[PDB]
Assembly symmetry: D2
Homo-oligomer: 324 residues x 4
């Protein structure tokens, strides 16, 4: 096991949820992870051709799982993968010592890296955030680190000079990236990081810089991964042939499928219900069973739930359309 670099990060990187038992919204329940569905999902993603698996971000419920639940979940993922694809766990926590303690334990179980935001009880500034990731990578230098650059969840907004500093840390190999307004500059400031746009932004981002932009992250794949596999294969054919017509059609399809996900189109309103909306979309699509949300985040306004289920139905149809 030799540590991951940015060169090893290509293709469809799919973020899976942490499947929950039918009583997982109850604070009294203690072993709420469905390890059978957890295993089954891993088998079907790898069989579908995904290049790598991320986990334990916001909708993966890193916030609301217990430590014993996280260890059993990671263990099951690791066994089932059997080293066939790289795997990132997630270990964001409220302080640097807890982050380090979790990362050490989950790397030892067999995850290859951690998808990592920053502690967010106190809003972090730029030097605080740089030193945080430096401390972690120095404390566990065998862990690859994916920056989870979510300003809604983590308050800190991951600005341009932050990315210049992360490119200096060998462990930081990739980033779960949101809007691409400054992707052109961030690629220049951060040559050593594989920036993963969102799946819907992969088309545009790869056109900006087809040399650097070779991978993306997907949560839509939890509704049926054929669409993400099709987009990956068609973009890389497009880079060679110069014919982006079919790649644009898939990408436009993916955008339309997400058109009801965010309440009122509002990322901040979506962020209040990130966990529930992603899981309900996934529940609705029927490709896997995400299940109820662990507390406190088990209350979603019905109007918002409907938007997520419509998106989930739209992605299941896209999976059928782009299958075989």
């Amino acid at each position: 096991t030799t540590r991951l670099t940015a060169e090893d990060i290509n293709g469809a990187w799919t973020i899976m949820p942490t499947p929950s038992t039918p009583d997982a919204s109850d604070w009294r329940s203690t072993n709420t992870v469905d390890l059978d569905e957890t295993a089954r999902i891993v088998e079907e993603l790898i069989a579908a051709g995904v290049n790598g698996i991320l986990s334990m971000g916001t909708f993966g419920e890193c916030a609301t799982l217990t430590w014993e639940e996280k260890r059993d979940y990671v263990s099951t993922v690791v066994e089932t993968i059997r080293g066939r694809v790289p795997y990132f766990c997630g270990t964001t926590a409220l302080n640097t010592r807890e982050v380090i303690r979790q990362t050490r334990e989950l790397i030892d179980i067999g995850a290859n890296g951690t998808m990592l935001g920053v502690p967010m009880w106190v809003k972090m500034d730029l030097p605080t955030a740089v030193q945080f990731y430096r401390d972690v990578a120095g404390a566990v230098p065998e862990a690859a680190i994916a920056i989870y650059a979510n300003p809604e969840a983590f308050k800190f907004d991951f600005p341009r000079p932050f990315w210049a500093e992360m490119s200096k840390i060998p462990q930081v190999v990739t980033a779960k990236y949101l809007g691409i307004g400054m992707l052109d500059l961030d690629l220049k400031l951060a040559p050593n990081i594989r920036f993963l746009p969102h799946e819907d932004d992969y088309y545009a981002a790869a056109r900006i810089n087809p040399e650097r932009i070779t991978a993306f992250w997907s949560s839509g794949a939890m509704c049926g991964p054929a669409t993400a596999i099709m987009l990956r294969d068609e973009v890389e054919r497009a880079k060679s042939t110069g014919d982006w017509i079919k790649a644009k059609a898939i990408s436009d399809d993916m955008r339309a499928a997400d058109s009801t996900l965010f309440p009122r189109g509002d990322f901040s309103e979506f962020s209040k219900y990130n966990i529930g909306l992603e899981k309900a979309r996934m529940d609705a699509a029927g490709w896997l069973k995400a299940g109820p949300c662990r507390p406190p985040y088990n209350l979603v306004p019905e109007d918002y739930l409907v938007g997520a289920q419509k998106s989930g139905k739209a992605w299941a149809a896209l999976h059928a359309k782009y299958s075989k």
Copy 2:
């Protein structure tokens, strides 16, 4: 031990820090609590006449202590207090199950309640926040609960209908309250909660409603508690006599002493450095030894540090001025 109500919450309620050892900014250190200073502070606050002790909020480093550190700190506080004043621990965490687990353990050690914000990885909405506090009070019904109504730390903004819902929960007995623009209405919506304004707002708040506003919280007391004791005694003399002149002079003194605390007067900018600024103020005042900040929050811009030290010097002088 019969559970606290709002009627038992009067006077100067002082928030103490979690004293740290000289190497506490280092993530490698593991037992960073100075239990001797922890004990010494408790003895001197009780000797000074404080009516109650809060702890483990933002600057008390609930975010960055380890669990073994929190148990040793609470244990030491509890022993030293010897039931002479009520004590609130702090158990905010990222989910409801961890909050419950911590609260149970620290109540068993001997704290009388918990100062409790809300999980903040996902921004909470109003029903989510109400049900969170309901779940906790139902799971540990012997715990008194002080709402830590900090919208900067916890994203959720604790609006008026939230307070109407908390007044319905017997366990919720008090609140660490910030601006008083809507205190008049919140008192009406929440008859069963003792609202603690900030010490600098106690003068105005007690004039608004001297029947309901009988207590306040203080962090300035960690620079010398005579000023808070003097303000408490003089406001209650003012309520009876109707002569608020001396109470206004103390309160104006306290406001001027805080005039350099917030960088540029900005609560949000102060909130990025809440821990470091409070501790540096306390370090500067010399009444107790707060010490270095546990990681990641150990980096404060020097200009900001100077403002905090000036405030700390201003409060030490106020303590001398209002002593004996």
Copy 3:
């Protein structure tokens, strides 16, 4: 002689700019109902108001034409007959326009201008201070009421701003919002009468009964008997030390306002500040505010309902306190 803070007492009511029934049409040219203007002023004074402010946000200072403004003030100036003080409003997009407007309307017979700041570009503190010093120096016979609304004017009117405005003789008063820093601001600005919102006057008067002697009211456009009763009752409370009846009136006023703000949110209310106030007033039936001049004539129906319910509650209160 120009107003000082010592002249600013009791209930100060903010007047809409009443509009003719074609006022939403951008083709319209003279959309002020000058007869309803005159009649509101007569009825306001008869009811015992202490002074009249106007031409702020819901007064449509932003959407009136210049000639419409000239005719409005003239109508108000001559209906008042010098019986109460009157502030017009002249907030515009730059200092020179603010000055040119303040000159003409003071000359027509306004006592002062209720004034926010140009807000195309958000000002910092020195920009705002200099702006107010510029206007005060340019029209020194005009009093100034700071219209301190950060939602409309972006700038948040912080503590050091109030200290500076106390340095300007012309700044006699301030239409003030949340009272969380009022105790401090009264200390920093000794020469300014701070007007809390009518619902906040009870608490503010109790904080500092010497300084807090006046408030501003828009609910009085629904029937001014409630605001007049709150002024008289608070004045009696400051002498008897018995605030029960003042708290009863104040708690009624909050209740009547409880459906005004869409979702309880001040910033969502600010998006429809014009429409919701005038729709509330129209539903109260004390006066006819009329359609909103373009572009702010579109308001969601759920929000409109909330303001009409509030108009009905204030109009009920006016009957309760007549």
Copy 4:
């Protein structure tokens, strides 16, 4: 005949409103240096610009007097001689004023108005849509360029807004900021030429080289050779498929802008948008932007230094690419 999106190509440069040396004084009355206006236009066209926008934020649409605006456009209209298209700017505080301004300046010989929305009260989506439909219907010979700046105009110009503007023939183009949703917006608004910022044109052209054929530039006021070279080089790149030299030019432009934003913060830059741009231009020495009309003549010195460093970098680039 009125412009369509098919007429909007290449480098579109935004002109300051040059000011006489007394222009900061609120007592001043005619503060446009009409001879510098005329001379900038001559030099811009000679340099090969495709079209001229003006009178946005740093163009001081907010702080010019009406007569100053009339004389400015006349000077531009007659110096252009119909050689390139010209957009004036007529954003004001209400629809009727926006219309009255657009009529006169189009009549003087502007081809369109660069237009944001009234911003005393923040508009929602239907308010903004109706506002633009109102203006387009009221001056149909005028083209419209949406000036989509949420910092100045509060409203954030979301995706459903762009779909509506594509329904309006007059809306031919958009001065556009961050490009994170450009791919989607191009799909929702087929009839609008989207102008990215000059630094963003490289990436946007690569996303959609058929649609992204034009950009807006304020750095060209520091010396327009860099923007002209980026247009020609990007056009060659779309044919050769070789983007190395376009990326070199683009990366130079970002570097020259790297000290413009105080603390890298767009919202802090927006507080001094007028002053920082004109101070940058003054320091470049290609033209004389001049003092800022009140009230926006105060800028912190550290920020001023940052803009002057940027002016020097762009002026260096102009020499590099002449």
